[PDB]
Write an enzyme that holds these catalytic residues in place. Structure first.
Site, PDB file in Angstrom:
ATOM      1  N   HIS A 118      25.430  32.553  30.967  1.00 47.31           N
ATOM      2  CA  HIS A 118      25.886  33.726  31.677  1.00 47.31           C
ATOM      3  C   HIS A 118      26.381  34.819  30.734  1.00 47.31           C
ATOM      4  O   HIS A 118      26.767  35.868  31.231  1.00 47.31           O
ATOM      5  CB  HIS A 118      26.979  33.296  32.670  1.00 47.31           C
ATOM      6  CG  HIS A 118      26.829  33.852  34.065  1.00 47.31           C
ATOM      7  ND1 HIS A 118      27.226  35.117  34.513  1.00 47.31           N
ATOM      8  CD2 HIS A 118      26.271  33.177  35.107  1.00 47.31           C
ATOM      9  CE1 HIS A 118      26.909  35.159  35.816  1.00 47.31           C
ATOM     10  NE2 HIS A 118      26.326  34.013  36.193  1.00 47.31           N
ATOM     11  N   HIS A 146      30.678  41.581  40.709  1.00 46.94           N
ATOM     12  CA  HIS A 146      30.249  40.633  39.677  1.00 46.94           C
ATOM     13  C   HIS A 146      31.305  40.375  38.575  1.00 46.94           C
ATOM     14  O   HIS A 146      31.121  39.478  37.752  1.00 46.94           O
ATOM     15  CB  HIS A 146      28.918  41.134  39.109  1.00 46.94           C
ATOM     16  CG  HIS A 146      28.095  40.088  38.419  1.00 46.94           C
ATOM     17  ND1 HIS A 146      27.594  38.942  39.022  1.00 46.94           N
ATOM     18  CD2 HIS A 146      27.517  40.220  37.195  1.00 46.94           C
ATOM     19  CE1 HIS A 146      26.736  38.397  38.148  1.00 46.94           C
ATOM     20  NE2 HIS A 146      26.667  39.149  37.043  1.00 46.94           N
ATOM     21  N   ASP A 175      50.817  37.465  33.796  1.00 47.59           N
ATOM     22  CA  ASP A 175      52.092  38.172  33.618  1.00 47.59           C
ATOM     23  C   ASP A 175      51.931  39.631  33.194  1.00 47.59           C
ATOM     24  O   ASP A 175      52.898  40.258  32.752  1.00 47.59           O
ATOM     25  CB  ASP A 175      52.992  37.430  32.630  1.00 47.59           C
ATOM     26  CG  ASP A 175      53.191  35.975  33.009  1.00 47.59           C
ATOM     27  OD1 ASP A 175      53.454  35.704  34.198  1.00 47.59           O
ATOM     28  OD2 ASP A 175      53.084  35.101  32.123  1.00 47.59           O
ATOM     29  N   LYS A 205      34.222  38.964  36.370  1.00 43.17           N
ATOM     30  CA  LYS A 205      35.220  37.911  36.222  1.00 43.17           C
ATOM     31  C   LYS A 205      36.230  38.242  35.125  1.00 43.17           C
ATOM     32  O   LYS A 205      35.868  38.379  33.943  1.00 43.17           O
ATOM     33  CB  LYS A 205      34.545  36.580  35.921  1.00 43.17           C
ATOM     34  CG  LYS A 205      35.483  35.400  35.873  1.00 43.17           C
ATOM     35  CD  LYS A 205      36.175  35.197  37.211  1.00 43.17           C
ATOM     36  CE  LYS A 205      37.682  35.244  37.092  1.00 43.17           C
ATOM     37  NZ  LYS A 205      38.332  35.387  38.425  1.00 43.17           N
TER      38      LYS A 205
END
EC number: 3.1.16.1
Lengths: 393, 392
Positions: free
Chosen positions: A319, A117, A124, A119
């Site tokens: 969310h 789940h 860099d 994200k």
């Protein structure tokens, strides 16, 4: 390092705050800037990928921002950016593989009976994004989301990559010393966040994916709750006192909020998210916290609901998954149910700093404008008035 | 031993059950019989003594049953009955000392920051009363009290006497206090000729010797072993160590059982002018667990005992018991964390199978209580409830 946190908000089209009560960049702007700046690596952990309309089996123009990201991702690998992906094992990932972007599929249902789940991005290994995006065009401009981009924050991005490299190894549970973290709840990093000192640490959600010295996401969440002395403001997608087949009861966060509001008098605000995929067993357990109020202790609970877009699968939710006190911040990717802290992968950023301004007060002003929004209703609002599938309420 | 358990209940004058069909000895009748039969010893643990009207600073005729008890107690010591009393250190005890009845005062506030809230008798180490009735004429006729008298029950009375012995020593653990008959391995008793498993638990862990089950442990085990219903009538239920603390230990067991196992939970708490109104919110936090899919169902009701108001501490239901499809628990502690940590308390737990017997007698008592007019919803108008009422 001149670390700057920007709180970047995905805002659904047609959702707005009339007072500009906190204006800050879009997740799309942040991501396109991160990509355009990227030159060495783009470590990116996501639950799924659904950037293209065709990969949705939809034809909405608002896919363009994700398809631009996809186009830009298709430029990254021939530009020489070492794009690598970890994704939850269930076309865009084949397009990326043909572009040269690496993909690995994680069988989280085999490993720990859950999902990937998380994200986040690490760019860099200097910048990062962490938050409630979902690596799809819908997360960018179909669902309300919060995340932190921490520019020039190389020492902290270089530890969020430690969270990614675990999922990258799973998609190929022991952890080797490589995964360990010194910068945790007991001894955060000292970071000069916008030039004002702060203490910051990152947590992971299921204990199998917490290496030694990593604070568990539940431990960090409960501690932020127990250290608070004046208020606890929480905005989270789902909240259940369960391990959501056969029924288990999970009091862990419920007890922290009961204890804190009673013993310490702390004001608790819970802002929980409602949509057609919300489990109805939430309502009784939210009302069981809202009853701790009259005298004497104060928990208050509110329902966030993001209002043609209904034709889109998984569109129109808030969310978001964060908390803020008079003393600390918590930005996360786990929902608040016992499976997300035991069986499912998740991560969170916690930042404490003192005084006015800074990240803690920006996040609090975000929470305040959310809570005061029309998009936050009471825990007993008339369901048809909510302008969405009030399945829980 | 031909152990017979009788559930003996003090009913307040003017309080009566439309269910009928549930006749039992009064605590007065059972106590007077226990005294009249007593010939060697009478141990008793007591919260406070207030048998005489003058010792109440009242002049109500219904003291007579307690004064008869007092008169009979005044006969016991010259009859040769070794009367000994443990009482919570704060005239009747002086009248008893004049009679030759021994008294010891227990400094529970020094020892564990609580009181000696137990109420029980042990006669000839062969019968016992355990329950809520105080050594107080108001207990015997002005507040509702439940207890069990277990006649011919020498092996179990001989273990309750030991619980008083602990108090008797405080008012002045080694192997003398150890107990085999507990929640892990109850005693085999032929209660009314039908086998049963029975054990006694004590409330504050300092007053639980090795092998004694803690009263909270026995209460939570009964709650977590249930499979069909949990019925609980108790005077005070506070999920707090009544500087603010938290005592969710019972609250979690009741949430867990109804959610994980689909158990029907009934809580029948007692409301009076001295109920801590903090309790009301914590009761509303359990009645929130009702749903159609989950089979979680906690229901909560308030028991209130409606000229008698001039009497101090009259007109409460002081009862403390629980019954499941599987077990009984008669207790003397209320359900606040101090009563399981700081304060003295005691309970009997009896499991037996089939129809009839103690478990179904106690369950029929619970059901007639629960169906009583004296049981009101947690949202009832306090004016309709007919008494001083700090939870409504």
């Amino acid at each position: 390092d001149p670390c700057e946190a920007v709180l970047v908000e995905s805002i659904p089209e047609g959702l707005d705050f009339p007072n500009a009560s906190t204006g800050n960049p879009s997740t799309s702007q942040a991501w396109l800037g991160l990509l355009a700046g990227a030159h060495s690596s783009l470590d990116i952990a996501s639950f799924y990928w659904t950037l293209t309309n065709n990969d949705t089996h939809t034809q909405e123009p608002s896919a363009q921002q994700g398809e631009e990201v996809l186009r830009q991702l298709q430029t990254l690998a021939p530009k020489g950016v070492n794009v690598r992906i970890a994704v939850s094992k269930p076309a865009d990932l084949q397009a990326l593989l043909q572009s040269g972007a690496q993909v690995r599929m994680v069988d989280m249902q085999k490993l720990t009976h859950g999902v990937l789940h998380t994200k986040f991005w690490v760019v860099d290994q200097t910048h990062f994004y962490l938050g409630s995006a979902n690596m799809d065009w819908r997360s960018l401009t179909q669902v309300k989301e919060l995340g932190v981009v921490m520019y020039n924050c190389s020492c902290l991005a270089r530890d969020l990559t430690k969270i990614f490299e675990a999922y990258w190894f799973l998609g190929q549970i022991p952890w080797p010393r490589f995964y360990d973290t010194r910068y945790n709840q007991e001894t955060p990093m000292e970071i000069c966040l916008n030039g004002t000192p702060a203490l910051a640490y990152l947590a992971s959600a299921p204990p199998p994916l917490c290496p030694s010295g990593r604070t568990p996401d539940l431990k960090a969440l409960l501690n932020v709750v127990d250290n608070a002395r004046s208020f606890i403001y929480v905005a989270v997608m789902n909240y259940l006192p369960t391990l959501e087949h056969p029924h288990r009861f999970w009091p862990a966060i419920d007890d922290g909020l009961r204890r804190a509001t009673y013993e310490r008098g702390v004001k608790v605000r819970l802002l929980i998210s409602c949509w057609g995929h919300s489990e109805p067993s939430m309502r009784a357990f939210l009302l069981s916290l809202a009853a701790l109020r009259d005298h004497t202790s104060d928990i208050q609970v509110k329902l966030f609901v993001v209002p043609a877009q209904a034709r889109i699968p998984y569109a129109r939710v808030n969310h978001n998954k964060y908390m803020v006190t008079e003393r600390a911040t918590y930005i996360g990717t786990s929902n608040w149910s016992g499976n997300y802290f035991t069986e499912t992968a998740g991560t969170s950023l916690l930042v404490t700093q003192n005084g006015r301004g800074g990240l803690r007060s920006q996040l609090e002003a975000i929470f305040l404008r959310d809570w005061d929004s029309p998009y936050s209703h009471d825990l007993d609002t008339s369901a048809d008035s909510v302008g969405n599938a009030c399945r829980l309420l």
